[PDB]
């Protein structure tokens, strides 16, 4: 259903402090929730396409690698 709600506030803060954020305005959590949902939708869409093209029933790490590296998505910036 809405398992994106299961991505926890302390988690996001924990991700933030790892990225050097001293403090967080309240609206960032939902925003961080949307970015991830959006992101794991491109990747999982692609991973699943590789698993089926290979006529397989398990998603493998090579599917995840290939999904991630696929064109038409920003990973870091202008480079890719």
């Amino acid at each position: 259903r809405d398992n994106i709600q299961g991505i926890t506030k302390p988690a996001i803060r924990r991700l933030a402090r790892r990225g050097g954020v001293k403090r967080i305005s309240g609206l960032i959590y939902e925003e961080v929730r949307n970015v991830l949902k959006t992101f794991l939708e491109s990747v999982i869409r692609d991973a699943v396409t590789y698993t089926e093209h290979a006529k397989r029933k398990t998603v493998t790490s090579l599917d995840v690698v290939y999904a991630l590296k696929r064109q038409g998505r920003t990973l870091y910036g202008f480079g890719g």
């Binding site: 939708e41 999982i44 991973a47």
Partner: protein, 78 residues
């Protein structure tokens, strides 16, 4: 290998999404190595974005990240 979101919810979410996009009727399984790969990548991804966002707060003399910072970060990244 040190994850910041707990394995259990992240896996739930991964199933939900894969259930919607897969072409198969029976639920698609994931090797446990694959979901950990994905999670590490997803976390690294949000950290990259969180730190660009942070840089844009500092640029504006704030220490508090704001929605608009994260939105400007996404504009400049492409």
């Amino acid at each position: 290998t040190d994850l910041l979101i707990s394995r259990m919810p992240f896996a739930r979410l991964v199933k939900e999404v894969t259930d919607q996009f897969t072409t198969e009727s029976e639920p698609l399984r994931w090797q446990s190595m694959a979901i950990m790969a994905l999670q590490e990548a997803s976390e690294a991804y949000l950290v990259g974005l969180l730190e660009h966002t942070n840089l844009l707060a500092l640029h504006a003399k704030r220490i508090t990240i704001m929605r608009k910072d994260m939105q400007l970060a996404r504009r400049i990244r492409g």
